[PDB]
């Protein structure tokens, strides 16, 4: 698993078209993160197998206490809440970045994104 499933719902979108403010506003609503508005949330893009592989030597290294960092870089879109209210409509500003990602793994599956 349930935590791996939750990780995908909250943090994975394979192939976005736009990666702009409108995208953030749409996907945050679709993934159930707007009641109340989540303040910051990252979405990782690309192939699911590469993300799972962070949990193995194939695409990851030990990081800090009990986390793992990816060897490869990923396209990641950060959505940051704008305005002063916790309640909809939730307005977001998007950053379309590219970087290594840090996760915690359990039984070989990512279950938490650091962020």
Curated annotation (Swiss-Prot):
Its EC number is 3.1.27.-. GO terms for biological process: actin filament polymerization; angiogenesis; antibacterial humoral response; antimicrobial humoral immune response mediated by antimicrobial peptide; cell communication; cell migration; defense response to Gram-positive bacterium; hematopoietic stem cell proliferation. Changing residue 98 to I: In ALS9; uncertain significance. Changing residue 33 to P: Homodimerization is similar to wild-type; causes mislocalization in the cytoplasm; strongly reduces ribonucleolytic activity. One of its GO terms (cellular component) is cytoplasmic stress granule. Has weak tRNA ribonuclease activity by itself due to partial autoinhibition by its C-terminus (residues 140-147), which folds into a short alpha-helix that partially occludes the substrate-binding site. In absence of stress, the ribonuclease activity is inhibited by RNH1 in the cytoplasm. In response to stress, dissociates from RNH1 in the cytoplasm and associates with cytoplasmic ribosomes with vacant A-sites: ribosomes directly activate the tRNA ribonuclease activity of ANG by refolding the C-terminal alpha-helix. Changing residue 15 to E: In ALS9; reduced ribonucleolytic activity. GO terms for molecular function: actin binding; copper ion binding; DNA binding; endonuclease activity; heparin binding; peptide binding; protein homodimerization activity; receptor ligand activity. The keyword Nucleotide-binding does not apply. A motif (Nucleolar localization signal) lies at residues 29-33. Expressed predominantly in the liver. Also detected in endothelial cells and spinal cord neurons. Disulfide bonds join 24-79, 37-90, 55-105. Changing residue 52 to R: Found in a patient with Parkinson disease; uncertain significance. Changing residue 11 to A: Abolished ribonuclease activity. does not affect binding to PLXNB2 receptor. Changing residue 78 to A: Increased ribonuclease activity. Its main location: secreted. The active site is at residues 11, 112. It is an enzyme of class 3 (hydrolase). It is found in: Secreted; Nucleus; Nucleus, Nucleolus; Cytoplasm, Stress granule. Changing residue 3 to A: Affects substrate preference. Significantly decreases binding affinity for RNH1. Secreted ribonuclease that can either promote or restrict cell proliferation of target cells, depending on the context. Endocytosed in target cells via its receptor PLXNB2 and translocates to the cytoplasm or nucleus. Under stress conditions, localizes to the cytoplasm and promotes the assembly of stress granules (SGs): specifically cleaves a subset of tRNAs within anticodon loops to produce tRNA-derived stress-induced fragments (tiRNAs), resulting in translation repression and inhibition of cell proliferation. tiRNas also prevent formation of apoptosome, thereby promoting cell survival. Belongs to the pancreatic ribonuclease family. Homodimer. Interacts with RNH1; inhibiting ANG ribonuclease activity. Interacts with PCNA. This is Angiogenin. It comes from Homo sapiens. The lineage of its organism: Eukaryota, Metazoa, Chordata, Craniata, Vertebrata. The gene is ANG. The chain holds residues 27 to 141 of 147 of the full protein.
